[PDB]
């Protein structure tokens, strides 16, 4: 995990899962969940889904690994409560820099 960048800070998103408990449970804890994502700039490899994919997986990684060694068994739900949020953020982080493509 060297050579990537980190775009600006957005506020945390709120993604529904199919129950309002999952909204709140995350929310009240959301201080721990990510609110920025690792990316690389608009040099060449720009995309939507495909650019999200790896930006997510990397930012998810440096949450999921640490938690395991910080005395936290995290589950598929705990991880997905990151993933939806990281996907949101990776969307926004691409889009943010992509706005400077119509003011160049």
From Swiss-Prot:
GO cellular component: cell surface; cytoplasm; cytosol; dendrite; endoplasmic reticulum; external side of plasma membrane; extracellular exosome; extrinsic component of membrane
Annotated consequence of substituting residue 79 to I: In CJD; uncertain significance
Effect recorded for residue 74 to S: In GSD; atypical form with neurofibrillary tangles
A Gene Ontology BP annotation from the UniProt entry: regulation of glutamate receptor signaling pathway
PTM annotation: The glycosylation pattern (the amount of mono-, di- and non-glycosylated forms or glycoforms) seems to differ in normal and CJD prion.
Positions glycosylated per UniProt: 57, 73
Domain of life: Eukaryota
Gene Ontology molecular function terms on file: amyloid-beta binding; aspartic-type endopeptidase inhibitor activity; ATP-dependent protein binding; copper ion binding; cupric ion binding; cuprous ion binding; glycosaminoglycan binding; identical protein binding
Predominant location category: membrane
Disulphides: 55-90
Effect of residue 64 to K: In early-onset dementia and dementia due to prion diseases
Keywords on record: Amyloid, Amyloidosis, Cell cycle, Cell membrane, Copper, Disease variant, Disulfide bond, Glycoprotein, Golgi apparatus, GPI-anchor, Growth arrest, Lipoprotein, Membrane, Metal-binding, Prion, Repeat, Signal, Zinc
Protein location: Cell membrane; Golgi apparatus
Disorder noted: PrP is found in high quantity in the brain of humans and animals infected with neurodegenerative diseases known as transmissible spongiform encephalopathies or prion diseases, like: Creutzfeldt-Jakob disease (CJD), fatal familial insomnia (FFI), Gerstmann-Straussler disease (GSD), Huntington disease-like type 1 (HDL1) and kuru in humans; scrapie in sheep and goat; bovine spongiform encephalopathy (BSE) in cattle; transmissible mink encephalopathy (TME); chronic wasting disease (CWD) of mule deer and elk; feline spongiform encephalopathy (FSE) in cats and exotic ungulate encephalopathy (EUE) in nyala and greater kudu. Creutzfeldt-Jakob disease: Occurs primarily as a sporadic disorder (1 per million), while 10-15% are familial. Accidental transmission of CJD to humans appears to be iatrogenic (contaminated human growth hormone (HGH), corneal transplantation, electroencephalographic electrode implantation, etc.). Epidemiologic studies have failed to implicate the ingestion of infected animal meat in the pathogenesis of CJD in human.
Comment field on protein domains: The normal, monomeric form, PRPN(C), has a mainly alpha-helical structure. Misfolding of this form produces a disease-associated, protease-resistant form, PRPN (Sc), accompanied by a large increase of the beta-sheet content and formation of amyloid fibrils. These fibrils consist of a cross-beta spine, formed by a steric zipper of superposed beta-strands. Disease mutations may favor intermolecular contacts via short beta strands, and may thereby trigger oligomerization.
Functional summary from the UniProt entry: Its primary physiological function is unclear. May play a role in neuronal development and synaptic plasticity. May be required for neuronal myelin sheath maintenance. May promote myelin homeostasis through acting as an agonist for ADGRG6 receptor. May play a role in iron uptake and iron homeostasis. Soluble oligomers are toxic to cultured neuroblastoma cells and induce apoptosis (in vitro). Association with GPC1 (via its heparan sulfate chains) targets PRNP to lipid rafts. Also provides Cu(2+) or Zn(2+) for the ascorbate-mediated GPC1 deaminase degradation of its heparan sulfate side chains.
Subunit structure: Monomer and homodimer. Has a tendency to aggregate into amyloid fibrils containing a cross-beta spine, formed by a steric zipper of superposed beta-strands. Soluble oligomers may represent an intermediate stage on the path to fibril formation. Copper binding may promote oligomerization. Interacts with GRB2, APP, ERI3/PRNPIP and SYN1. Mislocalized cytosolically exposed PrP interacts with MGRN1; this interaction alters MGRN1 subcellular location and causes lysosomal enlargement. Interacts with KIAA1191. Interacts with ADGRG6.
Family: Belongs to the prion family.
Misc remark: This protein is produced by a bicistronic gene which also produces the alternative prion protein/AltPrP (AC F7VJQ1) from an overlapping reading frame. The alternative prion protein/AltPrP (AC F7VJQ1) and PRNP have no apparent direct functional relation since a mutation that removes the start codon of the AltPrP has no apparent effect on the biology of PRNP. In mouse and hamster, the alternative initiation AUG codon is absent and is replaced by a GUG codon.
Protein name per UniProt: Major prion protein
Organism this protein belongs to: Homo sapiens (Human)
Boundaries of the shown chain within the full protein: 125 to 228 of 253
